[PDB]
Amino acid sequence: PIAEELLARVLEPYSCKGCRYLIDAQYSATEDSVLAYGNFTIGESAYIRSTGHFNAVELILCFNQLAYSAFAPAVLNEEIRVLRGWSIDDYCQHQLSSMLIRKASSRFRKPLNPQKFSARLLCRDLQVIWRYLKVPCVIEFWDNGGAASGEIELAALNIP
């Protein structure tokens, strides 16, 4: 489980906008892998009136929140070999300017209950390669049935 307050500091960029959607998360890490779970709620859309359903834009936003949230305690606890040399302060300093999506793939089935849903994230085969961390990720939503998923490759620019 990830401490609210670590959540809240890491997701402040979205909170100061009313767009924090991750309720709670839990994680597991190794030297080159992270695995996390989140619970999510969407009160209303920031960018459009109201579709009465998920919207793919919201899949990415929830993936972004959960991923920033999953790496935080891994960085804090120095669990990722390649990220030792970063404190949580470094990590938080790099969030906005230096953590990018290089490619992403999405699929949508039974629409999701925006009001109450969860996700599973797994990031594997991290490697250094600008000099970046490439970070292949897989995520899966559900809630009501309904499911969604991707396939996202990230680039982290500072590091180590």
Ligand X SMILES: CCCCCCCCCCCCCCCC(=O)O
Binding site for its own copies (CB under 8 A): 13-14, 16-17, 19, 45-53, 55-57, 60-61, 64, 96-97, 100-108, 111
Strand partners of residue 117: 40
Place of tokens 């629409």: 111
Selected binder of ligand X within 99, 112, 121, 139 (CB under 6 A)? 99
**Residue 77 touching ligand X (CB under 6 A):** no
Nearest to its own copies of 58, 79 (CB atom): 58
Q: Distance between CA atoms of 51 and 65, rounded to whole angstroms? A: 22
Q: Are strands 34-40 and 147-156 parallel, antiparallel or unpaired?
A: unpaired
Residue 16's binding partner among ligand X, its own copies, none (Cβ under 5 to 8 angstroms by kind) is: its own copies
Q: Looking at residues 113 to 152 of the shown chain, list those that interact with ligand X (rule: CB under 6 A).
A: 133, 135
Residue 71 binding: pick among its own copies, ligand X, none (C-beta 5-8 Å cut-off by kind):
ligand X
Cβ–Cβ under 8 Å, residues 151 and 105 = yes
What is the rounded radius of gyration, in angstroms, for the C-alpha atoms of the chain? 15
